[PDB]
Amino acid sequence: TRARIGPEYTELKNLVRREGLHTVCEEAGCPNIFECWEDREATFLIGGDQCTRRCDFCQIDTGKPAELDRDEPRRVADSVRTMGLRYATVTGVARDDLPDGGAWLYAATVRAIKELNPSTGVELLIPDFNGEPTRLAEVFESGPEVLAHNVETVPRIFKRIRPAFTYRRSLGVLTAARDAGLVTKSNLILGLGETSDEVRTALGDLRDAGCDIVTITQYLRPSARHHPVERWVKPEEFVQFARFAEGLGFAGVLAGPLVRSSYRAGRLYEQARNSRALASR
Numbered sequence: 001t002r003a004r005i006g007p008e009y010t011e012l013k014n015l016v017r018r019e020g021l022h023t024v025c026e027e028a029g030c031p032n033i034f035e036c037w038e039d040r041e042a043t044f045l046i047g048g049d050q051c052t053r054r055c056d057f058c059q060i061d062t063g064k065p066a067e068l069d070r071d072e073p074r075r076v077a078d079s080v081r082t083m084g085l086r087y088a089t090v091t092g093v094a095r096d097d098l099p100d101g102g103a104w105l106y107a108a109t110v111r112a113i114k115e116l117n118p119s120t121g122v123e124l125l126i127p128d129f130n131g132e133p134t135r136l137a138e139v140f141e142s143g144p145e146v147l148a149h150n151v152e153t154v155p156r157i158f159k160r161i162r163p164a165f166t167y168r169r170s171l172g173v174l175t176a177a178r179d180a181g182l183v184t185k186s187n188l189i190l191g192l193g194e195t196s197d198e199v200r201t202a203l204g205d206l207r208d209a210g211c212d213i214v215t216i217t218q219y220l221r222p223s224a225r226h227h228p229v230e231r232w233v234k235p236e237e238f239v240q241f242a243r244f245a246e247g248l249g250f251a252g253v254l255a256g257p258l259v260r261s262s263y264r265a266g267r268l269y270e271q272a273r274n275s276r277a278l279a280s281r
């Protein structure tokens with residue numbers, strides 16, 4: 001039942017090792033790596049590992065970012081090409097130190113990946129760029145297969161532990177991406193102190209904002225400096241939340257102990273893609 005080491009994981013590992021490629025998969029010790037790499041899916045981080053913001057559940061440290069590296073989009077595109085990925089997720093940090101909030105860096109990375117990797121689905125997980133319409137438009141024009149912006153938690157909690165964001169602004173990002181014609185995605189992290197009723201209302205908020213794909217996961221505390229875990233969600237409770245989201249009309253729903261945002265991202269995109277094409281007939 002549990003994924004064990006297969007031939008495509010092995011190929012990818014060999015290619016990563018020789019070229020010295022950085023992946024979030026390896027660097028973060030993600031336990032899904034045997035399964036994801038067997039499906040040739042992987043995740044990359046752009047913009048450095050020092051974020052200009054601080055959200056209490058997030059393992060990324062807050063600090064002074066390094067200078068913009070304009071060679072990073074090519075580096076990521078080359079990694080995707082070397083690995084022969086079927087699906088690639090591009091993540092990053094907030095860059096309030098940059099005058100465009102890093103919008104060029106995100107767009108240029110999607111563009112570079114697509115130039116070299118025509119058959120690779122690309123998922124872009126973005127910060128909010130302060131909801132600035134010109135920044136969002138630059139990013140949307142790069143045309144990722146999935147545009148994700150994770151709200152992570154419910155408004156009561158969001159307000160406190162993501163103080164450089166606002167819940168309605170983040171919903172607005174998803175709406176802007178949907179309006180731009182992109183498949184959209186978000187994530188809820190349970191165990192942060194939210195009530196089940198707050199999860200149900202947040203799923204409704206996400207759907208009404210235009211969100212197509214939602215993941216619902218269990219919080220795993222990064223360290224004793226981070227937010228405490230306030231609940232361990234039972235399998236039957238995840239199933240209820242997934243049914244709730246399915247009933248709301250989300251095209252793709254995954255609930256459970258997913259560990260990271262990118263788990264099964266390729267399969268969820270395929271579901272959303274297929275359902276959109278079916279509806280468009």
Ligand code: SF4
Pocket residue numbers: 024025026030031032033034036037041042043260261262263264
């Ligand atoms: S869940 Fe994400 S980070 Fe973990 S192995 Fe899969 S693609 Fe990589």
Ligand code: SF4
Pocket residue numbers: 051052053054055058059060092093094127
């Ligand atoms: S969730 Fe995003 S903005 Fe918040 S600390 Fe993590 S990387 Fe930075």
